[PDB]
Amino acid sequence: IPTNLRVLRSILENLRSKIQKLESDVSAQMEYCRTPCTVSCNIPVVSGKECEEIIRKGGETSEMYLIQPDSSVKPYRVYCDMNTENGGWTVIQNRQDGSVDFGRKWDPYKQGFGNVATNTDGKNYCGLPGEYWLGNDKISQLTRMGPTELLIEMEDWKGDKVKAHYGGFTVQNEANKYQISVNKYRGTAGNALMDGASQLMGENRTMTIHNGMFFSTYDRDNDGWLTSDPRKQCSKEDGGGWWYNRCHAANPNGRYYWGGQYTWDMAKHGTDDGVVWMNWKGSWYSMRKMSMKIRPFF
Amino acid sequence: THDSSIRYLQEIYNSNNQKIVNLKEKVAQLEAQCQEPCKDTVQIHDITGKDCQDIANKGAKQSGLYFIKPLKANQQFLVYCEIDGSGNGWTVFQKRLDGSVDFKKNWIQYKEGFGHLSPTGTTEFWLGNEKIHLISTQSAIPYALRVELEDWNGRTSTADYAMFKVGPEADKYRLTYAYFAGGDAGDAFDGFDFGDDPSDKFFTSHNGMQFSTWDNDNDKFEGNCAEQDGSGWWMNKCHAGHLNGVYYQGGTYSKASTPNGYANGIIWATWKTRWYSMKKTTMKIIPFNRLTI
Amino acid sequence: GPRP
Amino acid sequence: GPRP
Amino acid sequence: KVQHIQLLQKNVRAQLVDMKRLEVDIDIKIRSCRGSCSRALAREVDLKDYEDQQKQLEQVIA
Ligand SMILES: *[C@@H]1O[C@H](CO[C@@H]2O[C@@H](C)[C@@H](O)[C@@H](O)[C@@H]2O)[C@@H](O[C@@H]2O[C@H](CO)[C@@H](O)[C@H](O)[C@H]2NC(C)=O)[C@H](O)[C@H]1NC(C)=O
Ligand SMILES: [Ca+2]
Ligand SMILES: [Ca+2]
């Protein structure tokens, strides 16, 4: 009873202040959002079906390029990595800061969102990639032109790096719910996609395989979790659009936790919703960098 | 005394809560404002056609970036169009203006194109032989070529050529035109007697010359013009007009500022001395009937 | 993670 | 330019 | 009257948890406006203070 009312008050008042601080932070931000951010990306002359054709055509620098995978639709912007693993990599996903929101609905994920590239300062062209999702229709169309390999890279907050390479990667069209398929793995990050979390056993490990899964968003449940409570859905809890099973071993489109380490009592729904890759850092570490790139196989 | 001390907290705990309820509602409103991408200042226009004149004819009124799809081409590609107040639409295929882009490239880069396109036309670039060949060789309709120079004083000249055209890769994107149409920059494409020799004029003309790069010599020299000069061009033995040459700042350079001693700057003999590199350059084409009909 |  |  | 002190004792523990999450949520959100809006408010989250108050409140319940 004594010191009890002493501390219990030192909390209520401390918290009442934190709230005012948050109210102001959010109020300032809402103000900054009256004006948009801007980029100026002059377009390279050299173009092609994808980034591998561009590199072969002489495009040597990493920056945004215009590509036309097919004469059906209009050419579109993309960031090409021409230095990593012999270049010719078309980036379809990228996380590096937390500049973009990835907890989006089905339509945005179908059409693509985020910023493909930004200005490298004192440069008329955009040589730095932004954070974005290319878009499921475009991803599917790209992986269906011919055999395709997938390169996944990540980095922790200390600078250590690992990768996951899949010699085969395909995403079906929307009619098949953008179903995924990957094979021929080789890497140092752990084959999370085909095998599921390594620190899990039997059935529990199996329900984290992504290979074979359909795509899901918080407003479109196609996961491998059979349930009734509309709240119990991988996308709603783990916060991103992804080929969720029940639920994941890797959540590259998760929430961007600053610093890396986070706890269940920090997560919105109490789950490991960060930019995760269990097979390397477990569920409670959120990568500093994450990206997915593709390139015609051969 | 506890009755008040304890009930004092209750009024705060429930105060913080209702505040949280309202704070979470604003966080939701903020999310609604953070879904769009940064706005890009460079936009590509909606109107498209066979070339930039086709686009102006359809109503386009501003210079910038448009997609064109020449009559026989497999796909559409991007180009910079210059649309004037008179409805003339020029397809620009070459631009120099600050020496930021390196023009010492190989056959494929000159074939495919390099540099960057900007809406305000403030970037250097080479469209690409294959695209220039596609545009200039569409269904019968002669194109006219205009050269635009600018020295480091603000002076500018021009040089027009009738029935401009560039052949297919099989014939090395050969350059051809029917004749010089006029211009105060002079007809450098017909050669220029440099003085060093009587046959200079003959060996430095360009009409009929195939395109050359250091890794693909098609010139009339036993040596390698493109390689010695560091560029891509319709070389003879070697040149009189050399728009894809080295960008020398100030305009004036000497035999000493060059590696081989050969004048490899942005030159146009009939207007300036070989040791004077232009400050800006632009090569663009337009259907001939368009040029003062 | 999983949902055992 | 020209050539020898 | 101790009936309520015992109550507020578990309501403050709940608000702490709730706030800690709102803190992390607001931080992720505000930052996600940097690729959309003119700029993103520069800040930091003080986790240790939330953890300190927690341990602190759990000690009082004992
Ligand atoms: C599959 O996992 C479940 C859930 O266990 C929890 O989550 C795991 C990922 C791991 O972190 C465990 O330490 C967690 O406890 C296991 O379920 C068992 O359920 C019974 C009753 O519901 C419970 O008494 C046990 O504690 C749980 N685990 C056991 C047996 O100790 C299940 O055992 C796991 N199965 C496999 C193949 O590992
Ligand atoms: Ca489900
Ligand atoms: Ca030769």
XYZ file of C-alpha atoms and ligand atoms in Angstrom:
701
model
C 0.000 0.000 0.000
C 2.778 2.464 0.925
C 5.324 2.744 -1.905
C 2.645 1.099 -4.051
C 0.763 4.355 -4.746
C 4.149 6.051 -5.150
C 5.285 4.012 -8.143
C 1.829 3.375 -9.617
C 1.640 7.156 -10.071
C 5.186 7.451 -11.432
C 3.900 5.259 -14.249
C 0.557 6.823 -15.126
C 2.133 10.261 -15.361
C 5.191 9.042 -17.268
C 2.940 7.296 -19.783
C 0.577 10.262 -20.066
C 3.581 12.241 -21.267
C 4.754 9.622 -23.763
C 1.267 9.820 -25.303
C 1.508 13.577 -25.771
C 4.940 13.078 -27.318
C 3.515 10.518 -29.744
C 0.554 12.771 -30.497
C 2.924 15.528 -31.541
C 5.242 13.266 -33.542
C 2.251 11.969 -35.524
C 0.916 15.489 -35.876
C 4.171 16.787 -37.333
C 4.334 13.831 -39.721
C 0.792 14.375 -40.956
C 1.994 17.888 -41.715
C 5.014 16.722 -43.717
C 2.602 14.581 -45.727
C 0.942 17.584 -47.306
C 3.847 17.555 -49.740
C 5.237 14.476 -51.504
C 8.847 13.389 -51.868
C 10.185 13.696 -55.400
C 12.738 12.063 -57.659
C 13.990 12.969 -61.103
C 14.942 9.936 -63.098
C 16.166 10.589 -66.622
C 15.755 7.413 -68.641
C 18.628 5.457 -70.160
C 18.474 5.009 -73.906
C 19.416 1.353 -73.854
C 16.421 -0.902 -73.185
C 15.439 -4.555 -73.498
C 13.194 -7.433 -72.411
C 14.764 -7.466 -68.956
C 18.052 -6.622 -67.274
C 20.073 -9.513 -68.730
C 19.353 -8.338 -72.280
C 20.382 -4.780 -71.265
C 23.752 -5.907 -69.865
C 24.369 -7.835 -73.088
C 23.435 -4.653 -74.998
C 26.088 -2.673 -73.151
C 24.214 -1.331 -70.107
C 27.039 -1.596 -67.572
C 25.903 0.577 -64.665
C 23.434 -0.279 -61.919
C 20.456 2.060 -62.078
C 16.850 2.279 -63.170
C 16.098 1.101 -66.694
C 13.018 0.768 -68.856
C 12.236 -2.819 -69.910
C 9.661 -4.496 -72.141
C 9.383 -8.218 -71.251
C 6.669 -8.274 -73.888
C 5.106 -6.202 -76.663
C 1.707 -6.689 -75.005
C 2.082 -4.061 -72.280
C 3.839 -0.732 -71.973
C 7.548 -0.682 -71.111
C 8.072 -0.171 -67.395
C 10.666 1.043 -64.921
C 12.881 -1.328 -63.030
C 16.181 -1.259 -61.152
C 18.961 -3.362 -62.699
C 21.842 -4.813 -60.632
C 24.660 -5.120 -63.170
C 27.518 -5.815 -60.728
C 26.408 -8.644 -58.425
C 27.088 -12.188 -59.645
C 27.988 -11.050 -63.165
C 25.071 -8.612 -63.333
C 21.919 -8.717 -65.433
C 19.698 -8.915 -62.360
C 16.172 -7.517 -62.392
C 15.179 -6.466 -58.877
C 11.584 -7.369 -58.041
C 11.835 -6.665 -54.297
C 13.997 -4.517 -52.031
C 14.219 -3.508 -48.352
C 17.053 -1.274 -47.047
C 15.512 1.353 -44.743
C 11.862 1.433 -43.774
C 10.809 4.046 -46.288
C 7.912 2.068 -47.746
C 4.832 0.399 -46.269
C 4.502 -3.268 -47.246
C 1.302 -4.096 -45.401
C -0.791 -3.518 -48.511
C -3.898 -5.082 -50.023
C -4.186 -7.471 -52.975
C -4.536 -4.849 -55.673
C -1.342 -2.955 -54.740
C 0.601 -6.244 -54.677
C -0.779 -7.143 -58.094
C 0.145 -3.737 -59.577
C 3.388 -3.013 -57.723
C 4.192 -0.274 -55.200
C 7.103 1.646 -53.667
C 9.966 3.542 -55.320
C 12.033 1.816 -57.941
C 14.970 4.234 -57.752
C 16.305 7.545 -56.406
C 18.947 10.166 -57.209
C 22.566 9.456 -56.298
C 23.057 13.145 -55.455
C 24.430 15.553 -58.043
C 23.148 13.072 -60.610
C 20.416 13.490 -63.231
C 19.876 9.734 -63.193
C 18.717 7.441 -60.422
C 21.501 5.015 -59.553
C 20.181 4.005 -56.135
C 17.253 1.623 -55.678
C 14.338 2.542 -53.457
C 12.111 0.110 -51.589
C 9.516 -1.597 -53.769
C 7.555 -4.626 -54.920
C 7.617 -4.999 -58.713
C 4.121 -6.439 -58.811
C 2.742 -9.956 -59.035
C 1.480 -9.670 -62.616
C 4.880 -8.423 -63.778
C 6.706 -11.008 -61.617
C 4.629 -13.805 -63.061
C 5.044 -12.614 -66.615
C 8.793 -12.323 -66.138
C 9.260 -15.817 -64.678
C 7.163 -17.394 -67.451
C 9.160 -16.121 -70.440
C 11.681 -18.903 -69.879
C 13.644 -20.726 -67.116
C 14.430 -18.268 -64.341
C 16.847 -18.167 -61.397
C 16.218 -16.255 -58.137
C 18.825 -14.571 -55.943
C 17.919 -13.528 -52.399
C 20.315 -11.367 -50.401
C 20.189 -10.049 -46.847
C 22.268 -8.221 -44.284
C 22.022 -7.872 -40.515
C 22.550 -4.666 -38.567
C 26.235 -5.538 -38.077
C 27.131 -5.879 -41.737
C 27.253 -9.647 -42.097
C 25.828 -10.976 -45.354
C 24.328 -14.187 -46.691
C 22.321 -15.203 -49.718
C 19.940 -17.813 -51.078
C 20.091 -18.817 -54.714
C 17.418 -20.822 -56.516
C 18.145 -21.980 -60.041
C 14.443 -22.303 -60.725
C 11.688 -19.862 -59.830
C 8.211 -19.368 -61.255
C 5.110 -17.451 -60.198
C 1.843 -18.324 -61.912
C -0.693 -15.759 -63.083
C -3.501 -14.312 -60.972
C -5.962 -17.042 -61.940
C -3.753 -19.502 -60.044
C -3.336 -17.038 -57.189
C 0.283 -16.305 -58.174
C 1.330 -19.754 -56.948
C 5.074 -20.042 -56.317
C 7.622 -22.740 -57.131
C 11.392 -22.847 -56.520
C 14.166 -25.448 -56.845
C 17.942 -25.933 -57.217
C 18.962 -24.168 -54.019
C 22.503 -23.172 -53.014
C 23.403 -20.546 -50.468
C 24.405 -19.573 -46.958
C 21.120 -18.176 -45.667
C 19.421 -21.567 -45.354
C 16.886 -23.067 -47.764
C 13.918 -21.563 -45.943
C 11.730 -21.554 -49.034
C 11.852 -25.260 -49.855
C 12.576 -26.769 -46.421
C 11.041 -24.438 -43.829
C 12.632 -23.290 -40.581
C 15.603 -25.465 -39.594
C 14.953 -25.007 -35.870
C 11.539 -26.666 -36.190
C 10.550 -30.324 -36.060
C 8.438 -32.530 -38.290
C 4.968 -31.135 -38.883
C 5.913 -27.775 -37.402
C 8.802 -27.425 -39.827
C 6.674 -28.584 -42.740
C 4.034 -25.901 -42.276
C 6.674 -23.218 -42.900
C 7.631 -24.333 -46.410
C 6.709 -21.621 -48.949
C 7.326 -23.595 -52.107
C 3.996 -24.595 -53.613
C 2.068 -21.895 -51.706
C -0.302 -19.303 -53.097
C 0.028 -15.563 -52.508
C -1.927 -13.860 -49.700
C -2.669 -10.296 -48.531
C -4.557 -9.123 -45.462
C -7.680 -8.673 -47.599
C -7.303 -11.965 -49.524
C -6.640 -15.180 -47.584
C -5.021 -17.961 -49.610
C -2.669 -19.260 -46.929
C -2.257 -22.829 -45.694
C -3.980 -22.131 -42.371
C -7.475 -23.627 -42.144
C -9.417 -21.563 -39.638
C -12.627 -19.685 -38.827
C -11.544 -16.673 -36.794
C -11.035 -14.057 -39.556
C -8.326 -12.627 -37.310
C -6.279 -15.804 -37.593
C -4.577 -15.231 -40.945
C -0.846 -15.182 -41.736
C -0.992 -11.943 -43.697
C -2.979 -10.015 -41.049
C -0.692 -11.176 -38.227
C 2.679 -11.279 -39.976
C 2.031 -7.989 -41.793
C 3.003 -8.445 -45.429
C 1.901 -9.852 -48.766
C 3.589 -13.244 -49.219
C 3.463 -16.930 -50.207
C 2.464 -17.743 -46.618
C 1.915 -21.328 -45.510
C 1.169 -21.629 -41.829
C 2.780 -19.252 -41.573
C 6.383 -18.641 -42.580
C 10.105 -19.412 -42.382
C 10.881 -16.185 -44.290
C 8.847 -12.944 -44.213
C 10.874 -10.606 -46.509
C 7.885 -8.256 -46.824
C 7.444 -7.959 -43.055
C 7.600 -4.856 -40.842
C 10.921 -3.014 -40.768
C 12.181 -3.112 -37.177
C 15.002 -0.662 -36.528
C 18.051 -2.223 -34.923
C 17.238 -5.830 -35.765
C 16.198 -7.406 -32.456
C 12.519 -7.214 -31.490
C 10.157 -9.081 -29.159
C 6.660 -10.550 -29.290
C 5.514 -7.778 -26.966
C 6.732 -5.285 -29.552
C 4.831 -6.888 -32.401
C 1.338 -5.689 -33.294
C -0.165 -9.187 -33.079
C 2.531 -10.785 -30.963
C 4.058 -12.728 -33.838
C 7.394 -12.685 -35.652
C 6.307 -10.096 -38.232
C 9.710 -8.611 -39.003
C 11.854 -8.819 -42.123
C 12.688 -12.388 -41.171
C 14.660 -15.353 -42.486
C 14.506 -17.875 -39.631
C 17.156 -20.207 -41.023
C 19.806 -17.560 -40.315
C 18.698 -15.448 -37.361
C 15.514 -17.046 -36.060
C 12.119 -15.367 -35.703
C 13.064 -12.344 -33.609
C 15.706 -10.643 -35.764
C 14.634 -8.218 -38.535
C 17.136 -7.816 -41.404
C 18.658 -4.452 -42.308
C 18.727 -5.319 -46.013
C 16.631 -7.795 -48.011
C 16.083 -8.069 -51.764
C 14.921 -10.534 -54.410
C 16.400 -10.512 -57.924
C 15.800 -12.567 -61.063
C 17.631 -13.322 -64.314
C 17.145 -15.677 -67.289
C 18.819 -18.955 -66.314
C 20.949 -20.723 -68.976
C -6.141 9.573 2.967
C -5.690 6.641 0.590
C -9.214 7.002 -0.808
C -8.144 10.069 -2.817
C -4.523 9.092 -3.473
C -5.721 5.811 -4.986
C -8.730 7.181 -6.882
C -6.436 9.855 -8.320
C -4.674 7.263 -10.454
C -7.929 5.788 -11.791
C -8.803 9.156 -13.332
C -5.447 9.098 -15.119
C -5.330 5.460 -16.220
C -8.721 5.918 -17.861
C -7.519 9.245 -19.227
C -4.498 7.700 -20.922
C -6.703 4.987 -22.401
C -9.249 7.204 -24.160
C -6.237 9.161 -25.431
C -4.693 5.988 -26.848
C -7.997 5.216 -28.574
C -7.867 8.594 -30.264
C -4.134 8.367 -30.979
C -4.573 5.043 -32.795
C -7.292 6.617 -34.930
C -4.844 9.288 -36.102
C -2.137 6.721 -36.817
C -4.712 5.189 -39.152
C -5.275 8.549 -40.878
C -1.518 8.904 -41.352
C -1.287 5.508 -43.055
C -3.780 6.766 -45.628
C -1.300 9.522 -46.505
C 1.763 7.288 -46.926
C 0.842 4.876 -49.727
C 1.892 6.802 -52.863
C 5.475 6.723 -54.338
C 7.712 9.779 -54.591
C 6.575 11.891 -57.531
C 9.026 11.582 -60.460
C 9.677 14.840 -62.334
C 10.263 12.982 -65.593
C 7.135 11.790 -67.336
C 6.641 10.082 -70.685
C 3.740 11.470 -72.739
C 0.695 9.360 -73.731
C 0.659 10.171 -77.455
C 2.602 7.809 -79.734
C 3.223 7.303 -83.458
C 5.648 6.320 -86.244
C 7.964 9.242 -85.509
C 7.918 12.607 -83.789
C 6.143 14.310 -86.703
C 3.366 11.764 -86.547
C 3.048 12.681 -82.872
C 2.960 16.432 -83.506
C 0.414 15.870 -86.259
C -1.808 14.124 -83.705
C -1.805 17.192 -81.497
C 1.201 16.852 -79.177
C 2.368 20.399 -78.400
C 5.357 19.980 -76.058
C 8.883 18.689 -76.407
C 9.759 15.720 -74.241
C 9.748 11.934 -74.170
C 7.426 9.837 -76.303
C 7.314 6.262 -77.498
C 7.530 5.758 -81.231
C 7.044 2.633 -83.241
C 8.379 3.010 -86.808
C 6.218 1.258 -89.367
C 8.369 -1.896 -89.580
C 9.984 -2.004 -86.108
C 9.290 -4.964 -83.804
C 8.809 -2.826 -80.718
C 8.292 0.760 -79.668
C 11.215 2.611 -78.121
C 11.706 5.923 -76.352
C 12.938 9.115 -78.037
C 13.096 12.837 -77.365
C 10.839 14.936 -79.574
C 11.227 18.587 -80.412
C 7.801 20.006 -81.198
C 7.753 23.659 -82.257
C 5.031 26.275 -82.480
C 4.537 25.393 -86.159
C 3.652 21.754 -85.613
C 7.045 20.452 -86.705
C 8.195 17.336 -84.879
C 11.888 16.414 -84.971
C 13.246 13.086 -83.727
C 16.557 13.866 -81.996
C 19.097 11.027 -82.240
C 22.298 12.696 -80.931
C 23.044 15.363 -78.323
C 26.230 16.852 -76.810
C 26.328 19.698 -74.303
C 28.557 19.120 -71.271
C 30.787 16.111 -71.873
C 29.226 14.080 -69.063
C 28.663 11.005 -71.252
C 31.598 9.029 -72.646
C 31.249 8.581 -76.401
C 34.121 6.111 -76.702
C 31.933 2.985 -77.031
C 31.845 -0.345 -78.907
C 29.706 -1.524 -81.827
C 26.821 -2.840 -79.751
C 26.494 0.249 -77.559
C 26.377 2.433 -80.664
C 23.914 -0.013 -82.162
C 21.645 -0.121 -79.109
C 22.153 3.458 -77.959
C 23.533 5.022 -74.793
C 23.245 8.059 -72.566
C 20.000 9.327 -71.022
C 16.787 10.898 -72.284
C 15.431 13.877 -70.326
C 12.099 15.757 -70.780
C 13.840 19.115 -70.965
C 16.386 17.787 -73.432
C 19.315 18.611 -71.161
C 21.178 15.298 -71.399
C 23.744 13.819 -73.775
C 22.913 10.629 -75.701
C 23.129 8.499 -78.833
C 19.816 6.947 -79.848
C 21.299 3.874 -81.508
C 22.006 2.981 -85.119
C 19.358 0.281 -85.226
C 16.679 2.769 -84.137
C 17.951 5.458 -86.502
C 17.884 2.937 -89.329
C 14.366 1.887 -88.415
C 13.033 5.451 -88.346
C 14.783 6.680 -91.496
C 13.817 3.613 -93.553
C 10.069 3.366 -92.868
C 7.675 3.218 -95.812
C 8.793 5.543 -98.621
C 8.941 9.133 -97.343
C 12.270 10.973 -97.323
C 13.631 12.280 -94.048
C 15.729 15.412 -93.686
C 18.678 15.656 -91.313
C 19.630 18.794 -89.423
C 22.871 19.394 -87.551
C 22.925 22.063 -84.862
C 26.204 23.399 -83.531
C 26.945 25.990 -80.858
C 30.375 27.420 -80.055
C 31.509 28.650 -76.678
C 30.358 32.192 -77.471
C 26.658 31.624 -77.995
C 26.892 31.441 -81.762
C 25.146 28.590 -83.567
C 24.916 27.263 -87.122
C 23.050 24.493 -88.910
C 23.543 22.050 -91.777
C 20.704 20.229 -93.554
C 20.810 17.104 -95.736
C 18.048 15.827 -98.028
C 16.851 12.231 -98.123
C 18.890 11.305 -95.029
C 19.089 7.588 -94.297
C 21.002 4.876 -92.422
C 21.188 1.299 -93.642
C 20.783 -2.039 -91.771
C 23.470 -3.729 -89.653
C 24.290 -6.033 -92.583
C 25.670 -3.025 -94.469
C 27.201 -1.526 -91.316
C 24.493 1.102 -90.853
C 25.916 2.942 -93.870
C 25.136 6.660 -94.020
C 23.541 8.149 -97.123
C 21.806 11.312 -98.261
C 20.955 12.749 -101.667
C 22.587 16.154 -101.181
C 23.390 19.159 -98.981
C 20.258 21.277 -98.519
C 21.961 24.326 -97.047
C 23.095 25.902 -93.800
C 25.654 28.376 -92.491
C 27.672 25.673 -90.710
C 28.801 24.405 -94.099
C 28.695 21.003 -95.772
C 31.417 19.213 -93.841
C 29.977 15.849 -94.933
C 31.471 16.536 -98.360
C 34.987 16.717 -96.963
C 37.304 19.651 -96.318
C 40.700 20.244 -97.892
C 42.688 20.462 -94.669
C 45.823 21.477 -96.537
C 48.061 18.638 -95.371
C 47.355 16.986 -98.733
C 45.430 17.527 -102.000
C 43.383 14.348 -101.542
C 42.272 15.384 -98.056
C 38.822 16.587 -99.175
C 38.172 13.310 -100.979
C 39.266 11.146 -98.039
C 37.355 13.136 -95.447
C 33.835 13.114 -96.920
C 31.118 11.098 -95.214
C 28.258 10.369 -97.625
C 28.354 6.648 -98.336
C 30.588 5.749 -95.388
C 29.704 2.779 -93.181
C 29.679 3.186 -89.419
C 32.812 2.353 -87.426
C 33.738 1.642 -83.788
C 37.166 0.590 -82.453
C 36.096 -3.062 -82.322
C 34.544 -2.938 -85.802
C 36.568 -1.002 -88.398
C 34.709 -0.218 -91.637
C 36.613 2.922 -92.638
C 38.742 3.677 -95.717
C 41.921 3.846 -93.648
C 44.383 0.996 -93.287
C 44.568 2.053 -89.653
C 41.635 2.383 -87.246
C 40.072 5.869 -87.271
C 37.356 5.134 -84.710
C 39.934 3.672 -82.395
C 42.544 6.378 -82.828
C 39.965 9.131 -82.339
C 37.930 7.415 -79.611
C 34.407 7.529 -80.994
C 31.753 6.018 -83.193
C 31.195 7.561 -86.586
C 30.879 7.235 -90.356
C 34.666 7.406 -90.827
C 36.472 7.778 -94.133
C 40.185 8.491 -93.649
C 39.260 9.930 -91.456
C 36.727 12.729 -90.974
C 35.720 16.383 -91.485
C 32.629 16.478 -89.273
C 33.043 14.471 -86.059
C 30.098 15.043 -83.724
C 30.754 11.970 -81.543
C 34.298 13.046 -80.625
C 36.020 14.089 -77.392
C 34.386 16.950 -75.488
C 37.156 19.506 -74.977
C 36.216 22.169 -72.427
C 36.423 25.748 -73.657
C 36.326 24.672 -77.274
C 40.034 25.078 -77.891
C 42.451 22.182 -77.635
C 45.773 21.422 -79.293
C 47.684 18.532 -80.832
C 49.111 18.189 -77.325
C 45.760 17.673 -75.589
C 45.250 14.608 -77.760
C 46.756 11.113 -77.246
C 47.748 10.372 -80.857
C 48.097 13.967 -81.984
C 45.018 13.641 -84.194
C 42.198 16.174 -83.730
C 39.484 13.976 -82.203
C 37.252 16.656 -80.722
C 33.675 17.607 -81.590
C 34.442 19.188 -84.953
C 32.772 20.478 -88.088
C 35.514 21.719 -90.394
C 33.474 23.929 -92.774
C 32.564 26.140 -89.791
C 35.425 26.000 -87.286
C 39.038 24.835 -87.145
C 39.690 21.155 -86.381
C 41.245 22.355 -83.129
C 37.938 23.805 -81.923
C 35.496 21.371 -80.284
C 31.832 22.465 -80.212
C 30.039 23.250 -76.965
C 26.719 21.722 -77.966
C 25.670 19.353 -80.726
C 22.368 17.968 -81.909
C 21.463 15.689 -84.788
C 17.759 15.293 -85.504
C 15.599 14.129 -88.386
C 12.184 15.082 -89.748
C 10.113 14.160 -92.769
C 11.398 16.275 -95.666
C 8.082 17.831 -96.783
C 8.093 19.324 -93.313
C 11.212 21.404 -93.924
C 9.610 24.518 -95.439
C 7.852 21.957 -97.683
C 6.957 -18.908 -37.640
C 4.473 -21.801 -37.364
C 0.962 -22.013 -35.893
C 1.003 -25.433 -34.273
C 41.061 15.082 -89.851
C 43.087 13.509 -92.712
C 45.728 10.776 -92.651
C 49.213 10.382 -94.162
C -10.490 -0.522 -0.869
C -7.466 -2.711 -1.616
C -9.872 -4.223 -4.140
C -9.027 -1.458 -6.603
C -5.300 -1.007 -5.956
C -5.036 -4.664 -6.963
C -7.042 -3.720 -10.049
C -5.147 -0.647 -11.225
C -2.103 -2.822 -10.578
C -3.023 -5.043 -13.525
C -4.384 -2.192 -15.621
C -1.104 -0.284 -15.526
C 0.695 -3.460 -16.498
C -1.623 -3.676 -19.496
C -1.198 -0.049 -20.519
C 2.598 -0.396 -20.413
C 2.417 -3.342 -22.806
C -0.103 -1.475 -24.955
C 2.033 1.681 -25.084
C 5.274 -0.166 -25.823
C 3.551 -1.615 -28.895
C 2.032 1.665 -29.957
C 5.522 3.141 -29.650
C 7.058 0.596 -32.001
C 4.031 0.828 -34.306
C 4.266 4.637 -34.605
C 8.007 4.374 -35.265
C 7.570 1.902 -38.143
C 4.684 3.954 -39.541
C 6.278 7.368 -39.413
C 9.363 5.928 -41.075
C 7.257 4.376 -43.846
C 6.248 7.896 -44.875
C 9.798 8.763 -45.874
C 9.318 7.172 -49.296
C 6.022 8.933 -49.785
C 5.959 12.337 -48.055
C 8.284 15.393 -48.158
C 10.215 14.010 -45.169
C 9.941 11.682 -42.186
C 10.120 13.046 -38.626
C 13.506 12.217 -37.106
C 13.150 10.347 -33.837
C 14.045 7.438 -31.594
C 12.199 5.041 -29.305
C 13.272 4.753 -25.668
C 12.767 1.021 -25.069
C 14.878 0.711 -21.917
C 12.594 3.176 -20.106
C 9.559 1.036 -20.906
C 11.423 -2.049 -19.728
C 12.596 -0.253 -16.582
C 9.103 0.872 -15.623
C 7.907 -2.694 -16.222
C 10.426 -4.483 -13.980
C 9.707 -1.592 -11.615
C 5.945 -2.276 -11.571
C 6.373 -6.046 -11.253
C 8.471 -5.454 -8.160
C 5.704 -3.419 -6.522
C 3.162 -6.189 -7.064
C 5.419 -8.295 -4.844
C 5.240 -28.713 -32.630
O 5.179 -27.490 -31.893
C 4.165 -27.549 -30.861
C 4.097 -26.186 -30.204
O 5.149 -26.054 -29.227
C 5.579 -24.725 -29.111
O 6.117 -24.219 -30.331
C 7.310 -24.890 -30.795
C 7.711 -24.226 -32.101
C 8.409 -24.808 -29.730
O 8.807 -23.457 -29.555
C 7.895 -25.353 -28.402
O 8.887 -25.175 -27.402
C 6.620 -24.610 -27.997
O 6.099 -25.163 -26.798
C 4.428 -28.695 -29.856
O 3.212 -28.868 -29.090
C 3.154 -29.521 -27.859
O 1.819 -29.311 -27.361
C 1.589 -29.915 -26.069
C 0.102 -29.795 -25.768
O -0.537 -28.886 -26.655
C 2.461 -29.227 -25.019
O 2.260 -29.836 -23.748
C 3.930 -29.356 -25.408
O 4.709 -28.560 -24.530
C 4.206 -28.948 -26.876
N 5.516 -29.449 -27.253
C 6.064 -30.458 -26.578
C 5.640 -31.876 -26.948
O 6.882 -30.284 -25.676
C 4.799 -30.019 -30.572
O 5.364 -30.917 -29.632
C 5.796 -29.798 -31.722
N 6.006 -31.026 -32.463
C 7.204 -31.316 -32.968
C 7.260 -32.386 -34.046
O 8.241 -30.765 -32.602
Ca -6.737 -19.365 -44.190
Ca 40.581 0.536 -91.202
